[PDB]
Amino acid sequence: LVPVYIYSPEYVSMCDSLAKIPKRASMVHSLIEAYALHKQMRIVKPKVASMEEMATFHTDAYLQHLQKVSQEGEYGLGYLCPATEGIFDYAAAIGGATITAAQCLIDGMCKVAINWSGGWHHAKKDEASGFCYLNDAVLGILRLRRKFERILYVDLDLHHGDGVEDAFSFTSKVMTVSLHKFSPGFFPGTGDVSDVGLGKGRYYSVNVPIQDGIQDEKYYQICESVLKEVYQAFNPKAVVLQLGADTIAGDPMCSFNMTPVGIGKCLKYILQWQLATLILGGGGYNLANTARCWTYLTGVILGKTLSSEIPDHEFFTAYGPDYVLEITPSCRPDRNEPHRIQQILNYIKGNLKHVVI
Numbered sequence: 044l045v046p047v048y049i050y051s052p053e054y055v056s057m058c059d060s061l062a063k064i065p066k067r068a069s070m071v072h073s074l075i076e077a078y079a080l081h082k083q084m085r086i087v088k089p090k091v092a093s094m095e096e097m098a099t100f101h102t103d104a105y106l107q108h109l110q111k112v113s114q115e116g117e118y119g120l121g122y123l124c125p126a127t128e129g130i131f132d133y134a135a136a137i138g139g140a141t142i143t144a145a146q147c148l149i150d151g152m153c154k155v156a157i158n159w160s161g162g163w164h165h166a167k168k169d170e171a172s173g174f175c176y177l178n179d180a181v182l183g184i185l186r187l188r189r190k191f192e193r194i195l196y197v198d199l200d201l202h203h204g205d206g207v208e209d210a211f212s213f214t215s216k217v218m219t220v221s222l223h224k225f226s227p228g229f230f231p232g233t234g235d236v237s238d239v240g241l242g243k244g245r246y247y248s249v250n251v252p253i254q255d256g257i258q259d260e261k262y263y264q265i266c267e268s269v270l271k272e273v274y275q276a277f278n279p280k281a282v283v284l285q286l287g288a289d290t291i292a293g294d295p296m297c298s299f300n301m302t303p304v305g306i307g308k309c310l311k312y313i314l315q316w317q318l319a320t321l322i323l324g325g326g327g328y329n330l331a332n333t334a335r336c337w338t339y340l341t342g343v344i345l346g347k348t349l350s351s352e353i354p355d356h357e358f359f360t361a362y363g364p365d366y367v368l369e370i371t372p373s374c375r376p377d378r379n380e381p382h383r384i385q386q387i388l389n390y391i392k393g394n395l396k397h398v399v400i
């Protein structure tokens with residue numbers, strides 16, 4: 044049945060307000076519309092998450108503090124997560140949206156559900172972190188757990204998905220896999236290959252640390268090698284996929300050197316498992332590139348090939364001077380030594396030998 048696309052005008056208007064990615068949500072939706080992909084999906088209106096729904100993960104003290112400062116304009120609300128007005132409502136909308144997508148997958152409405160404005164993977168139970176005020180990925184996973192026995196969370200953002208990993212670090216019911224830049228001084232600083240979870244969750248966390256300038260070919264080789272092993276050991280019943288576009292060449296994070304094609308190959312690999320899959324966005328600070336990326340990936344999900352020329356639509360001006368969908372890799376060096384990538388894969392392959400269902 045057709046992929047669910049989480050959308051309404053109020054939801055987009057809401058997500059547009061996020062001071063770090065102004066108007067990103069409209070740009071993404073607008074490009075998706077321009078290519079007519081929305082005609083081929085089921086549009087579902089996201090519900091706003093209630094206080095008890097957000098309480099499935101977040102502490103009631105954190106939530107009430109969030110609600111309080113959200114009028115005024117120890118819970119990590121500092122430089123990266125300032126206490127702007129309306130932040131509680133923005134957070135409730137995004138959490139509700141991810142939970143709605145989870146609910147669609149639980150009801151069998153679809154096999155794939157999309158919330159491009161979710162994917163806030165740094166937030167902790169009692170603390171905001173790295174622009175993330177609520178952990179919608181965790182909320183979505185917890186909802187899917189009503190139906191599906193084992194959940195795989197895959198995180199392809201530039202940054203380590205520490206909030207999600209930490210939430211599930213002690214359980215064997217959710218396996219977290221994150222590929223990410225791992226370098227001294229680079230946020231959030233966790234996720235070395237030797238981080239594998241703790242207690243009953245030992246070996247149920249996988250981390251692939253990567254260096255600057257990774258490109259599509261070697262990236263997909265890593266991702267495939269890891270996911271094949273995970274799938275065999277862990278046998279997941281549903282997948283939550285985080286696709287932050289801050290890996291994409293041109294991003295001001297200036298770290299990885301990926302194109303949406305390399306990412307999409309990772310996404311196809313997962314889609315061929317034919318499981319319930321909840322698709323989320325995340326980082327992505329070159330706004331037109333992020334819309335190019337997620338539009339392309341939406342094409343992949345629907346097996347359409349999309350035209351090279353960006354259609355005229357509202358933000359057409361943002362796509363100059365060349366006006367094409369493809370992104371060109373930058374000239375930046377690839378700092379990933381193939382011998383190092385090999386040890387990492389083998390290390391993980393070792394770890395996953397301990398996982399038997």
Ligand SMILES: CN(C)c1ccc(C(=O)NCCCCCCC(=O)NO)cc1
Pocket residue numbers: 123173174200201202230287289325326327
């Ligand atoms: C010298 N100085 C005052 C600073 C230096 C570095 C940062 C920083 O790391 N900023 C951004 C790191 C967090 C972004 C990660 C969020 C994300 O994209 N998640 O996906 C801040 C201040």
Ligand SMILES: [Fe+2]
Pocket residue numbers: 200201202287289325326327
């Ligand atoms: Fe990121």
Ligand SMILES: [K+]
Pocket residue numbers: 198199200201202203204221222223
């Ligand atoms: K990641």
Ligand SMILES: [K+]
Pocket residue numbers: 211212213214215216217218219240244247248
């Ligand atoms: K785990």
